[model samples]
Target: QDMEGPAAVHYQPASPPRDACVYSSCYSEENVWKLCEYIKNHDQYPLEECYAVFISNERKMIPIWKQQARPGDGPVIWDYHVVLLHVSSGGQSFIYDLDTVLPFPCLFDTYVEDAIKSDDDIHPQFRRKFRVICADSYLKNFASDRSHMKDSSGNWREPPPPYPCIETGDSKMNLNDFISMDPKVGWGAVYTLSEFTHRFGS
Candidate 1:
């Protein structure tokens, strides 16, 4: 796969080794967790400045383009998706979405245009919402039991990761809290499409 966009030269994070973060299909939360840990472990950036950006909506259905799963130009109607967001003191932001076919660490502006697209042309129900959790907070609070991946007969929907599931301090699963974009849920700060775009999209 060729570089999907211009090589962003403004803020170059250390290029992670090919196998830095643990990944499993349909488990973007865990993927981003390892990403946050990787940055902290590698001293890539101030953990406080990094964020786990969850792309979702009240309906839990959002369309994202340029994913490797759906080859060619089209959208994947995912229930939720997660990406690592690094906002610099200089007021620039980069998105690290493991699922995107776009640049590994794409500029927020370009990513919104090429990947997230516009909300205007789509139905209101499909309008996107963003959940921004500071990496420091996410690393401390996030957990998953992987039980959600099981089917009625106890078959794995998508195979679970080789590593163990992330555990909360109490050993309870709280993956839903992170995915919930509703402000009343109060897990993380929720942003409207335009608001988040303007705030982080250059």
Candidate 2:
């Protein structure tokens, strides 16, 4: 399948537009950072209330909702992905996922239910490896190296641009653009949920 280009379908978040943002694939860290920064600077939202959720999938075939995985099979793969969760002063929580067909900033439980479906019998323990941690802290530690995207032949190439770039009329450059501009710069670091909790949790 052609993995390039925007997703075939863009699903809106369950809630009405509290904000507007672009979407991308495999760039969850960038999306989370951009959203968090906007909330902190523009909405005056405190960083403490935000979170970054990391989901690591084992080697298994999974279905892509609303899309046929194959002629007779569902979309399945092994990969690591991330999303964001925010808690409001009123104690309401929302989930932000750039790659999912689910609405961005959907209810936290709604996201979980949709992401890990009970109907799929391929892997019952799929959710066991999932983890959620403080977004602010995760951003402080997470890092990205496009060098990893390069091949063993030493040929480094640029990745597709992430959403909401300045060229796209946004206020700032998107994550992929930022990474392309400086491959050596660190965005943040990544850690297991347990490691994050042990190192930074109260």
Candidate 3:
């Protein structure tokens, strides 16, 4: 099936020319075992017990966020993404921003927006749930269904960028097309895994 949102269009990896192994949410534990062992031995991450790397039945753990309750020590809840990765020997991982990498990869880019749902909302199929860490303004705009609102010209304003660029499988479509029919189309309909990695890297 096609992916749900901008995460589908932007963050999806380009295919390799049949040489390099591709990593994503559909990899097997045997394939990832070496990488997990390497990560564990090398201490690449700041935290120990990074069992988040292991995948069972093509399921891998992703760290969402560390929630702090009191002023002192608090619990750190993690989110997991069950994706596959092309584990090249000595290959390092970097957090690539979709806004910068997709549409075209560029240097000196800034499109950091945090999109998050309340902890109560996330449904867990895996052990840990991933959380989005977007700025308050961006989150508000994301949650807002501004399509029904009127514009300065009062012609029922058009859907903004990214949303307009969104296309369904049927035919060429724009935001105005979607809003006119169903202003709340796909509202609150989040691609769970996509939302997770959008805020936190795999």
Q: Which model scores highest in TM-score? A: 1
Candidate 1 residue spans exceeding 4 A from truth: 1-10, 14-20
- Per-residue lDDT over 108-180 for candidate 3, one digit per residue giving the tens place of the 0 to 100 score: 1111122122334444533332222222211122222333345677665433322222223443323222112
lDDT of each: 0.83, 0.48, 0.26
By lDDT, the best candidate is 1
TM-scores of the candidates are 0.91, 0.57, 0.20
lDDT of model 2 at residue 16?
Answer: 29
lDDT of 1 by residue, 1-202 (tens): 8763233466676337434657787888888898898888886578888899888888899999998789789999999999999887677788888888887788788899999999999999999899999988888888888888899898999988889888867646888877888787746689987999878865
> Ten-residue segment with the worst summed lDDT in candidate 3?
104-113
Which order, best to worst by lDDT?
A: 1, 2, 3
Candidate with the larger TM-score of 1 and 3: 1
lDDT of 2 by residue, 17-112 (tens): 534564344455556666666666664556787776654533323333312122332443424455676665544566666666566556555554
lDDT of 3: 0.26
What lDDT score is found at residue 127 in candidate 1?
A: 90
Query: Where does candidate 2 stray beyond 4 Å?
Result: 1-23, 57-78, 124-128, 154-202
Error of 2 at 9 (Å): 26
User: Can you give the lDDT of residue 21 in candidate 1?
Assistant: 51
